[PDB]
């Protein structure tokens, strides 16, 4: 599953036994209930530019 289009994950992908796929996020992010998107849990998450994020 992870091998095709990153398993649909916005960040990290993990394959499990069977058809099972888990998406994961970098520290400073949490996985949304869609099971694919990552949302910041902190004010300054890695790889986001605050001056552009704010405007």
């Amino acid at each position: 599953i992870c091998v095709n289009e990153n398993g649909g994950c916005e960040q990290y992908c993990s394959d499990h036994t069977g058809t099972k796929r888990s998406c994961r996020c970098h520290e400073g992010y949490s996985l949304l209930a869609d099971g694919v998107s990552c949302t910041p849990t902190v004010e300054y998450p890695c790889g986001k530019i605050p001056i552009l994020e704010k405007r």
Binding site: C2, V3, N6, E10, Q11, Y12, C13, H26, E27, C38, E43, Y44, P45, C46, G47, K48, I49, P50, I51, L52, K54
Partner: protein, 250 residues
């Protein structure tokens, strides 16, 4: 950086300036509040290991605006496979004595997981390279942080398109062969940052090349994806006496 533009202040918040005795040494990339990724060759001629400073939130070297944060470098970790004065395994992991405080101007770049970087990030054509290096080959270095957008090449395509050291599996080629745009020796250790779905990731390190923006040649970058596990394990370790540490690779 040759043929780029000034990076608008705060638009490269992961950029690090490395100083030795207050003098510009190299670039680096902040990956969290304690750790910086840079190039191993940057440390080949260091004797004053206790006078290494990493500056975060820097933009303009002629003025202090209050956004800059300075930290003494406590450790410089280099792979056992790197040989001073050569090209391969050109990576250094730096531990800051104390954490930096994240602000609008100081933010780490995401250190990706290996598989995601190999399977997804490796195929994003363009990435940003940045630094206060040479504005021209044998020219003055920049006073304001510069940034350049460069396209990545498969090594087979790079070798074919180029007019010399080997381009190994621990490296990748990026840039242009027309002598117009490239990172230079003063940008060494700086980030090669890749955008993917609203987030920026560390995919490369300014490493080496044949003179800045030389026709028939591309810039060579350290393939960070090969070092993810090596970096992750070292970031979990306790520091050791002495600044320089050679750590076994793999």
């Amino acid at each position: 950086i040759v043929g780029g533009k000034v990076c608008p202040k705060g638009e490269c918040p992961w950029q690090v300036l490395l100083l030795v005795n207050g003098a510009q040494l190299c670039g680096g990339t902040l990956i969290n509040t304690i750790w910086v990724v840079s190039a191993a060759h940057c440390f080949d001629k260091i004797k004053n290991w206790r006078n290494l400073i990493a500056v975060l939130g820097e933009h303009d070297l002629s003025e202090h605006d209050g956004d800059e944060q300075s930290r003494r470098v406590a450790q410089v970790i280099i792979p056992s496979t790197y040989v001073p004065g050569t090209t391969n395994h050109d990576i250094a992991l730096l531990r800051l004595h104390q954490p930096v405080v994240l602000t609008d101007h100081v933010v780490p770049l995401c250190l990706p997981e290996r598989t995601f970087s190999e399977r997804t990030l490796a195929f994003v054509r363009f990435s940003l390279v940045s630094g206060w290096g040479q504005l021209l080959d044998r020219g003055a270095t920049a006073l304001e942080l510069m940034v350049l957008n460069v396209p990545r090449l498969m090594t087979q395509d790079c070798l074919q398109q180029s007019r010399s050291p080997n381009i190994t599996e621990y490296m990748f080629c990026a840039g242009y062969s027309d002598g117009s745009k490239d990172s230079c020796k003063g940008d060494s250790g700086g980030p090669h940052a890749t955008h993917y779905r609203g987030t920026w990731y560390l995919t490369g390190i300014v490493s080496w090349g044949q003179g800045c923006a030389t026709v028939g040649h591309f810039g060579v970058y350290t393939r960070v994806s090969q070092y993810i596990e090596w970096l992750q394990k070292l970031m979990r370790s306790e520091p050791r006496p002495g600044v320089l540490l050679r750590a076994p690779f793999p």
